[PDB]
Structures are given as structure tokens and as C-alpha cells.
């Protein structure tokens, strides 16, 4: 499914062991309504793209990571391919999401 990250090492370093296969980062919160609303779509969308590796970063558990990525609200999505931020948007907009994934494949 989706690799739940809980470290700055499991991030800044694992954002390598993936290669080029796009990796979408999901910054969420157990307390934000829309954050949850789109969770299933994100997890069931992870089963729909192998060439893409999904990551979910909880803002509270990984405070270091969220502030190190300049996160303002949830849900916030950021895209990477070899440590490069090539995509980033906010809100539980599912279309914009799968769209941003299919246009940065």
C-alpha cells in the first residue's frame, strides 16, 4: 500500500532508494477532516500506480519533516523524483491529485 514514514532519515535518505519512480508525499493530520476524507483515495490510489511510490507524513509524529518541507495546511501534497520538488498542492481535491500524478509520471 503506502509507506508510512516516521523519520527524517526514512525521508531525506529513502527519497533515494526509490530512484526516479515518482514519489508523492502526503502530509496529513489525524485531526483534520478533509485530510481523512482523501486518505482512502490516496491509499487505494497507491494500489493503482506501481511506477509511483506513495508516502504519508503525519505532521505531528514527524514535526521535523513537516516544518522542514514548509508545510502550512492539510492535506498538502508534494511530489518528488530524485529529491526534486516537481509538484505541490493543497486541499482534498482528488482530481487535481491523480491529475498531478498523471502529468508528472
Amino acid at each position: 500500500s503506502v509507506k508510512q514514514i516516521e523519520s527524517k532519515t526514512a525521508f531525506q535518505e529513502a527519497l533515494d532508494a526509490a530512484g526516479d519512480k515518482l514519489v508523492v508525499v502526503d502530509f496529513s493530520a489525524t485531526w483534520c477532516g478533509p485530510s481523512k476524507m482523501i486518505k482512502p483515495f490516496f491509499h487505494s490510489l497507491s494500489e493503482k500506480y506501481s511506477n509511483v511510490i506513495f508516502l504519508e507524513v503525519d505532521v505531528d509524529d514527524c514535526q521535523d519533516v513537516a516544518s522542514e518541507c514548509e508545510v502550512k495546511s492539510m492535506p498538502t501534497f508534494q511530489f518528488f523524483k530524485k529529491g526534486q520538488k516537481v509538484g505541490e498542492f493543497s486541499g482534498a481535491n482528488k482530481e487535481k491529485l491523480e491529475a498531478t500524478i498523471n502529468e508528472l509520471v
Partner: protein, 495 residues
Amino acid sequence: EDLPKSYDYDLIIIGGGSGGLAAAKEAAQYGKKVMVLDFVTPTPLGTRWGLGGTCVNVGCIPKKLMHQAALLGQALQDSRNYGWKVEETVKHDWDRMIEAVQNHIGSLNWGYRVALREKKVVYENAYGQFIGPHRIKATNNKGKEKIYSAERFLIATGERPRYLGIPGDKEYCISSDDLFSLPYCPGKTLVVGASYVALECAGFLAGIGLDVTVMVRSILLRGFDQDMANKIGEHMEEHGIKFIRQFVPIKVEQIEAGTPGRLRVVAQSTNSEEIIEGEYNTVMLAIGRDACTRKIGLETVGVKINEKTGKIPVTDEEQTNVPYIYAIGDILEDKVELTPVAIQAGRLLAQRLYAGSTVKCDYENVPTTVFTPLEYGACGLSEEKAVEKFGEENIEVYHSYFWPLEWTIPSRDNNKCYAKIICNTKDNERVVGFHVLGPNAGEVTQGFAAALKCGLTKKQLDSTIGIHPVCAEVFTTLSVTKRSGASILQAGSCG
């Protein structure tokens, strides 16, 4: 001879409303023999009521109660999130509600006859009408007239709902006077007007689940800070209510009669000649009220009024031109048409006349609250009125939004509640205007009106510690001015 060899009463009050009753109880507190004349002529559809006046019968009381009925609707929803197993949607019963309201009014109609009997004041359910100096003609429902005399007389007849003067209105249209005791649920409703009466009513009807529409001629809440007025309109539309601007009805026609029936309303644009027609179950006219100062013979006694408004010009001591004929309440010219006012005026006029007091009634900076879906409280000058009276360059407006803590768990309506104060730069940043849009607006505005009677200034305000966690505390830290241009829109629960 002409003048009565003696006077029946030291004083006679024509009108048993807010002012007249407070004045009667006061005068009688000093022994004086008093008599109040109160009669409620029916509305076109035959509706009438007991003692107590406008506010008690067809005004404040019933309206705030129905407002509370709508607020409870919102509370029923808000409870689920706080862990209460409420149904998704609860139904509302019109009749149950009307009965409960009429039961409280009824208890008050009664409480007032007793209080009058208590102070030994003569209450007469008759229509008063001057016939000559110190003489008046009362006419009970049966028709039995009788003349009386008193050393002094007080006019306190208040007003009544005004009609359009168009075909079909007085026959198929209800006024606020009928609404509060309507025998059946109104259904599809078209509210005509934009006075606070119009929006307050349009507001709670929508609150209990009815399809409400409001036809507006020009602006909204003419006479109130417009910036606030529109924030209110915007909110009502956001919460269901439909508005039709720059339009006015020209004729009403009955499609079918019923409890309720069905009506057709033809209306014409304010300027253009474009005309449209809609179908409604009930049509209410809240287009203004008219002083009951004509059909009561004032010429036979001499009191002079305003040939066009019906208002009565008086001295700051409430006295009219004739030294023994005073007047108070709504009918007064260029005053404050609010119950507490009429009552303050009444209690004072009695103390000067019989207690020795020399205190006048203050019509400056009287606070007010409009009970719309989102309450609005104000006191002092409006923004537009401030710039005009002091010059735009000396008017600093401090504002801010706020999100009632009680609304965060239900997670609704952020950046709706708004607060603002108008400050006079050339007067130690004196607070000359106070405005708040939100929950319990009235409870919030009261104490601040007292602060205003003490000449509150920005420095003094900033020096006051707010109470946490409470809505009102927002006023104790306003730092952003309209002039600076900074954003005051706050973030949502998720950042």
C-alpha cells in the same frame, strides 16, 4: 362652564404600551390618581390582542422567542458532534410553537393588569379621543362612550404596520401583527421589505425550515452601518434565504384559498419596467409603521404634529406645545423607536412631574440589536456617519473577524463573525461607534454602551483584559485598521 370644575385624574395616559404602562406605574408610585386607556383596533383580517403594547404582543417578545426556536434548530445539529445522538434532521411543529408563544404573551397580558391594580391605577379597555381642553372621549368595544378629565395627559399610542396601498394586499397580506399568532404554518413565504422586522422574520422562518424569499426595494436596513447590513444579507443568502433586489409588488391575487392558500404576486422593477410574478403560500408586508396620531383628535385640544410623518415634536422634557399634554414612545419625532427608550422616557417624565427629579432622557448612543440568523449589535455612530461628522482623515476603524469556540467542533461558519469600532483621531481616539456581528450580540453590546456613556477611548480599551474564552474579548485587542489594509481573514481548522 367649559373647563371642568375639578379633574377626575391627575393624569390620563392614552396607550397601554411600553411607555404608557411604565409612566403609569411611576406616577402612581407617588400617589397620584392615574388611568390608562388601552384598546387594540383589529388588523384588516380581524386579529387583535391584550394589554402590554406592541413589543409584548406583536413585537420583541414573540419575535425573540421565534428567533430562539430557529437557534435551537441549529443547536440540535451542533449537538451530534459534541456526542449527542440526535437524528440527522428533526421536524418542527408550527402550531406547537405558536401555542407556546401565545401562552407566554397571555401570562404577560395578565401580569400587567395586576401590576396596574397593584399601584391602584385605573385600567380601561377603551379607545381614547380628545374632545376639548382636559377632556377625552373613551369608546369601549360595545360602543359605550364616556368623558373624563385630568390635570395632565400623556400620548403613547405607538404605531402599526403600514400597507402598500396596492390591489390585493390588505386582503391576502399579513403584517408582523398577524404572523405571531397565525393559525397555520405559513409555507412558501415572500417577505416584502428590508427593515429589521423583515429580515428578523425572514430569518427565523427560514430557521424552522420554510422556503423564504425577500423582495427588497433599495438597500437593506436603511439607517444602519451599511458595511454591517450587507454582511448580514450575505449571511442570510449563504444560509438559504433568497433575495430579489430592486423590485416592488404592484398587485396580489389569490390562486386558491387555504390554511394556507396560494397567492400570486406581480411585481415591478424599481426603475426599469421589467415585471415578474411568483407564487407563494403567504405574503408578509414589513415595509414600515405609522404613528397612531391622527384619528384621535389633537386639534380639538391644540397639540401640533407633523402633517406628513405623524410624529409629535416635543421638548427634551417630553412636553408638547400644550403645557399639560406630554408624549413619548415611537410616535415621537426624531427619537429612538425602541421599547427601553419609551420606558426610560416614561419613568423619568413621571419623576420630574411628581418627584422633583430634573433628569432628562438620553437619546444619544442608545444601543440596539437586530436578531437575524447571525445577531448584530450596535451602539454609537456608523462608519459612514463617522466620516461625514468628523472627516475621513480623523476616523480610524479597527476591525477583526472571530470564530466562536462553540463553532469549531461543529466546524462551521469561520470568518463570518465580525467586530469593529470607529475611533475619532482628533479626540484621544474616542470610541464613537461600536459594531458586532455574531452570537449573543446584545449581551455583548450592553456593557459597551455604558463604556460609551463614560467616553471610552482606544487606549482605555486596549488596557482592558478580555475574558477567555469568550467572543466579546475580541474587542479588547483590535490592532488592524481598515486604513492599513492588512488581511483579517483567519485560517480554518486545518491551518
